[PDB]
Amino acid sequence: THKVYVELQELVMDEKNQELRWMEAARWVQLEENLGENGAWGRPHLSHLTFWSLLELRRVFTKGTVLLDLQETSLAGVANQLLDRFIFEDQIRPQDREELLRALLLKHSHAGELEALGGVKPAVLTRSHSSLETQLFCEQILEKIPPDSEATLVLVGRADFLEQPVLGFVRLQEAAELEAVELPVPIRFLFVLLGPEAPHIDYTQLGRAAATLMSERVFRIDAYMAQSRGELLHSLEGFLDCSLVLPPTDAPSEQALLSLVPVQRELLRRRYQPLQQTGQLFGGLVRDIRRRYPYYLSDITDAFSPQVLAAVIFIYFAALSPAITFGGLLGEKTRNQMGVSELLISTAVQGILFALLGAQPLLVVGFSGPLLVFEEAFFSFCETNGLEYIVGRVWIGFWLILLVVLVVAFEGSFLVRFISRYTQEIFSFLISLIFIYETFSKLIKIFQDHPLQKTYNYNVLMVPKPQGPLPNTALLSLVLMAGTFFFAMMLRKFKNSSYFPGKLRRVIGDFGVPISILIMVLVDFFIQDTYTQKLSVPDGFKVSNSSARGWVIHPLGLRSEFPIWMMFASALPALLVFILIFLESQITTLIVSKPERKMVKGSGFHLDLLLVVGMGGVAALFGMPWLSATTVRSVTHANALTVMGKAQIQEVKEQRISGLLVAVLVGLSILMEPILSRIPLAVLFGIFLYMGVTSLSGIQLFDRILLLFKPPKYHPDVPYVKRVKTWRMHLFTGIQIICLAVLWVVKSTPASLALPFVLILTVPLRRVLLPLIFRNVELQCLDADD
């Protein structure tokens, strides 16, 4: 901090030589002293200001050109950099650059030289009444300036070639004793106020306002430690907050001014000075029921809308096609001991019971990839050790029930509170990317099976599948997939468009995926010659291998006797499957129940975990797959019932009818075979691409990844942008991308069942390693639950 000496200088003309020069007008040491005509300094007075002066000072400071810590020691440099930043910020035109530096480089006169010039008169720059203070204080320095003081120069001029008033605020890195202008103390700050004639603009009053602002201690300190124009603006707003206006009044002027003393003294007083642990057994479960089940009546009445029916038609295919595909693989890898029919019936029953009883009915319950990998591994283990795979599954279920009852009993689902937005978004982005990759690899496999060839064997066997390449199959599949994706996205855009009466637009855009599916299925149906792969459901509700097992499996064995040791050794695979289902379902519930998604009905973690794992364990007895809350399906369900207002999410149709109807349709899918046999897989591939793309909307990781490819100026007004440095946020995003790559490598590795543990290892990263390289404010701005 340093004491200040402000100097106001104006562009004038002399009578003797008619030469433009800068003339002393006023100076500030402790109070304002004005220089009048005849060269006598006036009486020191308080620096009163006019209303318009502070008006236009704030106006031109808002668009001000601010240079801080400028490394110049002469006026000519300060003048060249300023006139340059003037051009850079488009304050002035490049043509008037010269004339303005020709003006700024004129001689600076002072009080002693006024008499020798034969008078001084006001002047206006060309491209080629007396002041109130003079009238009231002027008609009739080195000792006062403190030794450790620095000076401010306020340059005020009128230039008719400028289009707008321009403010330039320059702070020097080192205080410089300029040669062009002589002062008792070195110049640090430099105010430049130039512009044309404008209404309500007295440039003398603008300079007086700027000098009074620089004479104030708080603003002087703020300008000393300012690093941007915003800090200077905020200090100016604080200055104007303490500014007091005296309206024209008839009160006796001595008392009128003396009444303002306590108002000033007060005005300057401060200027200068669901996952909580209860501890009760099954407390989380009973709290879950208490929170969700009161809304059961609304869960049936909120479903009476066409959006719910469109969501049913969407999620029906979105849950049936994975069921059919995973049924083919589970069977082809299990010798059909678990196949399409078992998976369909298990999906239907568990979905019906979950929609009827669950606390987050918008979750979609079904088979998944990690469960398929575990089934592969367990079947291989049973084949190696001469074991019965289905009985081992029965015993794995028995242990999963004891596990979910114990974790629900001790409120083990309170540990989900430590999975922050970091792990949630990493898992969501990874799952969406994997979904898109699998969807594209299916089309690649279709192209591989029927490549583009010059010649084809026209007599090929079609049953059960074509025994060789077929013409036009792969190209038509690509066309169908692209057309379905295109139509779905166009109808999604049309839902938010300005076209057609709103109701019909919002009902047509609500039925976007069903209309796209219908259109593309009709297109394929009218193309008869070209073959395309269709959906294939089993013949009837029968087990996939009647020669292997029945509908119920004896825990002691079917064709042999299950060994005693495996009944106890089943805990470890049960532990792994419990970890898989727990992590997947709990993170899915975290994602679908974010506060930003407008979920106002509440979600249940303990109750949903109990229902899912217990139903899986019970279905294991019937030799049926255990299910998990799939992330893509549940996110698509939540988005399909999400209502968008006049953009911004308004509400979500939280109801139990949509999931129940999806489960019922999945169970009935065997019966509705003549309709499902005319639906190509390419249409559903386009639908899967739509789901994978649309699942990326609410993930901040995807937005931050998109920011790395955007100029640091188009970054949105979000707290992780406006409060965090750009490269810091980019480093955060890059660390997340490294985690994504590590998890992707783990997935493609035969140790893909360890993916939950590598995902879990991100929580210690965020809570231990990230504070070592980021500050707390950065981490709260970058990793916020809401």
Ligand X SMILES: CCCCCCCC(=O)OC[C@H](COP(=O)(O)O[C@@H]1[C@H](O)[C@H](O)[C@@H](OP(=O)(O)O)[C@H](OP(=O)(O)O)[C@H]1O)OC(=O)CCCCCCC
Ligand Y SMILES: CC(C)CCC[C@@H](C)[C@H]1CC[C@H]2[C@@H]3CC=C4C[C@@H](O)CC[C@]4(C)[C@H]3CC[C@]12C
Ligand Z SMILES: *[C@@H]1O[C@H](CO)[C@@H](O[C@@H]2O[C@H](CO)[C@@H](O)[C@H](O)[C@H]2NC(C)=O)[C@H](O)[C@H]1NC(C)=O
Nearer CB in complex with its own copies: 3/534: 534
For ligand Y, which residue of 142, 245, 463, 564 counts as binding (CB under 6 A)? 564
SS3 561: coil
- Least spacing, CB of residue 712 vs its own copies, in Å: 10
- Output the CA–CA distances (angstroms, integers) from residue 742 to 426, 708, 745, 749, 753, in the order listed: 11, 20, 5, 11, 14
| Tokens 């049953």, residue located | 463
The strand pair at 187-194 and 149-156 is best described as: parallel
Number of residues engaging ligand Z in binding (CB under 6 A): 5
Assigned token pair, 363: 């979750």
φ, ψ of residue 69 in degrees (nearest 5): 55, 40
Per rule CB under 6 A, is residue 399 in the interface with ligand Y? yes
For ligand Y, which residue of 398, 422, 605, 626 counts as binding (CB under 6 A)? 398
Nearer CB in complex with its own copies: 257/452: 452
For ligand Z, which residue of 95, 128, 384, 547 counts as binding (CB under 6 A)? 547
- Least spacing, CB of residue 475 vs its own copies, in Å: 4
Closest CA to 159 of 129, 127, 191: 127
Residue 186 burial (C-beta neighbours within 10 Å; 0-12, 13-18, 19+)? middle
Quick check: 690 and 481 in contact, CB under 8 A? no
Nearer CB in complex with ligand Y: 203/398: 398
Quick check: 410 and 663 in contact, CB under 8 A? no
Assigned token pair, 80: 């060249």
Q: Which stretch binds ligand X (CB under 6 A): 3-11, 479-487, 496-504, 771-779?
A: 496-504
Q: x/- string (CB under 8 A) for its own copies, residues 504-543?
A: -----------------------x-xx-------------
The β-bridge partners of 67 are: 170
Q: Which stretch binds its own copies (CB under 8 A): 173-181, 399-407, 446-454, 578-586?
A: 446-454
Assigned token pair, 251: 């009160």
- Least spacing, CB of residue 718 vs ligand X, in Å: 17
Closest CA to 348 of 664, 658, 620, 611: 664
Closest CA to 121 of 32, 210, 11, 203: 11
Q: Which stretch binds ligand Y (CB under 6 A): 377-385, 393-401, 534-542, 732-740?
A: 393-401
Q: Which stretch binds ligand Z (CB under 6 A): 43-51, 165-173, 512-520, 543-551?
A: 543-551
Per rule CB under 8 A, is residue 454 in the interface with its own copies? yes
| Residue 545 contact partner, candidates ligand Y, ligand Z, ligand X, none, CB within 5 to 8 A by sort of partner | ligand Z
Closest residue to bound ligand Y by CB: 398
Q: Which stretch binds ligand Z (CB under 6 A): 355-363, 476-484, 541-549, 668-676?
A: 541-549
452-457-462-466 Cα dihedral, nearest 10 degrees: -40
Assigned token pair, 179: 């040669």
Per rule CB under 6 A, is residue 335 in the interface with ligand Z? yes
For its own copies, which residue of 272, 273, 714, 717 counts as binding (CB under 8 A)? 714
Cα distance between residue 26 and residue 47, in whole Å: 11
Per rule CB under 8 A, is residue 440 in the interface with its own copies? no
For ligand X, which residue of 94, 451, 555, 712 counts as binding (CB under 6 A)? 712
Per rule CB under 6 A, is residue 18 in the interface with ligand Z? no
| Residue 548 contact partner, candidates ligand Z, ligand Y, ligand X, none, CB within 5 to 8 A by sort of partner | ligand Z
Cα distance between residue 382 and residue 72, in whole Å: 82
Cα distance between residue 373 and residue 380, in whole Å: 11
Cα distance between residue 669 and residue 321, in whole Å: 11
Q: Which stretch binds ligand X (CB under 6 A): 228-236, 585-593, 604-612, 710-718?
A: 710-718
Cα distance between residue 591 and residue 424, in whole Å: 7
- Least spacing, CB of residue 575 vs ligand Y, in Å: 12
Secondary structure string (H, E, C) spanning 385-434:
CCCCHHHHHHHHHHHHHHHHHHHHHCCHHHHHHHCCHHHHHHHHHHHHHH
- The angle subtended at Cα 176 by Cα 170 and Cα 182, nearest 5°, is 100
Per rule CB under 6 A, is residue 713 in the interface with ligand X? yes
Q: x/- string (CB under 6 A) for ligand Z, residues 110-139?
A: ------------------------------
Nearer CB in complex with its own copies: 88/458: 458
| Residue 504 contact partner, candidates its own copies, ligand X, ligand Y, none, CB within 5 to 8 A by sort of partner | ligand X
Per rule CB under 8 A, is residue 500 in the interface with its own copies? yes
Nearer CB in complex with its own copies: 211/481: 481
Q: Which stretch binds ligand X (CB under 6 A): 144-152, 174-182, 309-317, 704-712?
A: 704-712
Cα distance between residue 718 and residue 706, in whole Å: 14
Closest CA to 287 of 343, 359, 344, 231: 359
First to last CA, the chain: 41
Q: Which stretch binds its own copies (CB under 8 A): 476-484, 629-637, 638-646, 729-737?
A: 476-484
Q: Which stretch binds ligand Z (CB under 6 A): 359-367, 444-452, 540-548, 777-785?
A: 540-548
Cα distance between residue 349 and residue 361, in whole Å: 14
Q: x/- string (CB under 6 A) for ligand Z, residues 336-365?
A: x-----------------------------
Alpha helices in 89-178 (DSSP H): 96-104, 132-137
Element (H, E) at 32: strand 32-34
For its own copies, which residue of 272, 458, 748, 772 counts as binding (CB under 8 A)? 458
- Output the CA–CA distances (angstroms, integers) from residue 195 to 100, 125, 154, 156, 168, in the order listed: 10, 9, 14, 9, 11
Quick check: 400 and 616 in contact, CB under 8 A? yes
Q: What is the CA radius of gyration of the chain?
A: 39
| Residue 547 contact partner, candidates ligand Z, ligand X, its own copies, none, CB within 5 to 8 A by sort of partner | ligand Z
- Least spacing, CB of residue 508 vs its own copies, in Å: 13
Per rule CB under 6 A, is residue 545 in the interface with ligand Z? yes
Nearer CB in complex with ligand Y: 92/574: 574
Quick check: 190 and 155 in contact, CB under 8 A? yes
Nearer CB in complex with ligand X: 272/499: 499
Per rule CB under 6 A, is residue 716 in the interface with ligand X? no
Cα distance between residue 557 and residue 97, in whole Å: 95
- Least spacing, CB of residue 701 vs its own copies, in Å: 17
Per rule CB under 6 A, is residue 709 in the interface with ligand X? yes
Amino acid at 475: L
Give the binding site for ligand Z (CB under 6 A).
335-336, 545, 547-548
Summarize as ranges the residues that interact with its own copies (CB under 8 A).
451-456, 458, 471-472, 475-476, 478-479, 482, 498-502, 527, 529-530, 706, 709-711, 714
Binding region for ligand Y (CB under 6 A): 395, 398-399, 402, 564, 567
Q: Interface residues with ligand X (CB under 6 A)?
A: 500-502, 504, 709-713
